[PDB]
């Protein structure tokens, strides 16, 4: 299996899945380093963000846990096809980037911090993650490049 992903047995359903400790990514079926990769994300802040403001709101006052659910929500949409990933980022990041449907370019090891930039690594081209903490929030990265 490729860097991050382990095989696991899901007790409710009998069958086995597959999940990345890396990128928080998990699913039922089976998966499969360059200088750059290009991500674009989703990132929902909460009020120990360390900017806890943002384009959409100036002061950000939801808590760490309810950030989770609104993650955790648009994963459920974006899994389930009633949305794609671009345009509920266009909505809803409290990015800056939300302006270019997410889009961060292209970036190597350095630049971006670390739990972010492991992630994004560990995602193959087209691949998305589960969610992934930084100080700025909580985000979903889905990786472009
Ligand atoms: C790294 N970056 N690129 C853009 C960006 C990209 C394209 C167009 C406009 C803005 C915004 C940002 C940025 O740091 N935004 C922050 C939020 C944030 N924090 C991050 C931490 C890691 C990776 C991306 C992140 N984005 C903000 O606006 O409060």
Same mark, same amino acid.
């Given at each position: 299996?490729?860097?991050?992903?382990?095989?696991?047995? /899901?007790?409710?359903?009998?069958?086995?899945?597959?999940?990345?400790?890396?990128?928080?990514?998990? %699913?039922?079926?089976?998966? /499969?380093?360059?200088?750059?990769?290009?991500?674009?994300?989703?990132?929902?802040?909460?009020?120990?963000?360390?900017?806890?403001?943002?384009?959409? %709101?100036?002061?950000?006052?939801?808590?760490?846990?309810?950030?989770?659910?609104?993650?955790?929500?648009?994963?459920?949409?974006?899994? /389930?096809?009633?949305?794609?990933?671009?345009?509920?980022?266009? %909505?809803?990041?409290?990015?800056?980037?939300?302006?270019?449907?997410?889009?961060?370019?292209?970036?190597?090891?350095?630049?971006?911090?670390?739990?972010?930039?492991?992630?994004?690594?560990?995602?193959?081209?087209?691949?998305?993650?589960?969610?992934?903490?930084?100080? /700025?929030?909580?985000?979903?990265?889905?990786?472009?490049?």
């Amino acid at each position: 299996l490729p860097p991050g992903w382990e095989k696991a047995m /899901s007790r409710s359903s009998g069958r086995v899945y597959y999940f990345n400790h890396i990128t928080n990514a998990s %699913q039922w079926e089976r998966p /499969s380093e360059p200088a750059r990769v290009r991500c674009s994300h989703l990132l929902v802040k909460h009020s120990q963000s360390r900017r806890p403001s943002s384009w959409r %709101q100036e002061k950000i006052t939801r808590t760490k846990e309810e950030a989770l659910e609104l993650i955790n929500g648009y994963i459920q949409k974006i899994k /389930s096809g009633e949305e794609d990933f671009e345009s509920l980022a266009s %909505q809803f990041s409290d990015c800056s980037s939300a302006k270019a449907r997410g889009d961060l370019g292209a970036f190597s090891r350095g630049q971006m911090q670390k739990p972010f930039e492991d992630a994004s690594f560990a995602l193959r081209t087209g691949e998305m993650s589960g969610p992934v903490f930084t100080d /700025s929030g909580i985000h979903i990265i889905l990786r472009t490049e």
